[PDB]
Amino acid sequence: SSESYETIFSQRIIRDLQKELVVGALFEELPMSSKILTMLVEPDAGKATWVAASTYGTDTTTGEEVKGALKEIHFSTYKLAAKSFITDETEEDAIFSLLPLLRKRLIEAHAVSIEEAFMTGDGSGKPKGLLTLASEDSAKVVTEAKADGSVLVTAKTISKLRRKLGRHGLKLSKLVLIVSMDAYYDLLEDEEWQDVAQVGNDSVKLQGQVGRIYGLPVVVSEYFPAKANSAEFAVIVYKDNFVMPRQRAVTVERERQAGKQRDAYYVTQRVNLQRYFANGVVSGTYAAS
């Protein structure tokens, strides 16, 4: 029947497209197939293992040369659950294909949760989230905005945080700005757009994130808690900071019972957010401070 395999293909292709929900996350996905990828090295934090091997490699401090840097880079991803049976008693009515409506919105809120979880997440069962991974670095900085009163907040914030991102990547590759539309309510209908806030299409040009700040493009929408004390921002180079360490995904089991006769579409998903450095991001802040 349906509620079964012939769905899943026509289901995971829907997943293959909101795969591209880009509404915060899009990196180079590490694919997996085992379980943990655990790497036993210290990354880029001074090595840069340059050699003369010849002259004199300054015989004093330090050697490695600074903290740290092995975490270690373990990567067992996260089995992500969604779940919702349907009217599993009524495609005996051979509808084949009310599910083109009736599915996919499951993939909708499913991915809604995915990206929210991705950018606001605890660590566990998922991995971490953005403002959460902001929230132990003291990237909560001070005090570019002031408690959502005299919030006319420009990019001086972004200027000194750009100088914070004058860092070890580049300038403006990638260097982004997942934002808020209230953060846009600062700098949409701004008269400036000083450097650039608007139009930031600007043509249209980059990914789908229009509005840019010297090319710091835009992701708003239902993630930032308001009243000034979350970030307005997400100033992170997408390159150096983070990839996706995914493995599988949907191999949803459309199991049946589940009583009063309905079909447990036990929804699977397996991707990851994980980092390397000490810092990858400062954002906002934009605080009640």
Tell me: cis bond preceding 199? Omega within 30 of 0 counts: yes
The SS3 call for residue 124 is coil
Among residues 95, 142, 152, 226, which is the contact residue for a copy of itself, using CB under 8 A? 95
> Is residue 38 involved in binding a copy of itself (CB under 8 A)?
yes
Kindly state the smallest distance separating residue 49's Cβ from a copy of itself, in Å.
Answer: 4
> Is residue 255 involved in binding a copy of itself (CB under 8 A)?
yes
Among residues 12, 47, 146, 248, which is the contact residue for a copy of itself, using CB under 8 A? 47
Kindly state the smallest distance separating residue 175's Cβ from a copy of itself, in Å.
Answer: 12
Structure token pair of residue 3: 């509620």
> Is residue 192 involved in binding a copy of itself (CB under 8 A)?
no
The rounded distance, in Å, linking the Cα atoms of 91 and 116 is 33
> Is residue 62 involved in binding a copy of itself (CB under 8 A)?
no
Q: Is the dihedral of CA 84, 90, 96, 100 positive or negative?
A: negative
Tell me: cis bond preceding 69? Omega within 30 of 0 counts: yes
Kindly state the smallest distance separating residue 137's Cβ from a copy of itself, in Å.
Answer: 20
| Binding span for a copy of itself by CB under 8 A among 5-13, 63-71, 145-153, 226-234 | 63-71
The rounded distance, in Å, linking the Cα atoms of 25 and 244 is 9
> Is residue 54 involved in binding a copy of itself (CB under 8 A)?
yes
> Is residue 257 involved in binding a copy of itself (CB under 8 A)?
yes
- Please give the distance of CA 50 from its chain centroid, rounded to a whole number: 33
Closest by Cα among 265, 40, 284 to 179:
284
> Is residue 4 involved in binding a copy of itself (CB under 8 A)?
no
The SS3 call for residue 186 is helix
For the window 205-244, what string marks contact with a copy of itself as x by the rule CB under 8 A?
A: -----x---x-----xx---------------------x-
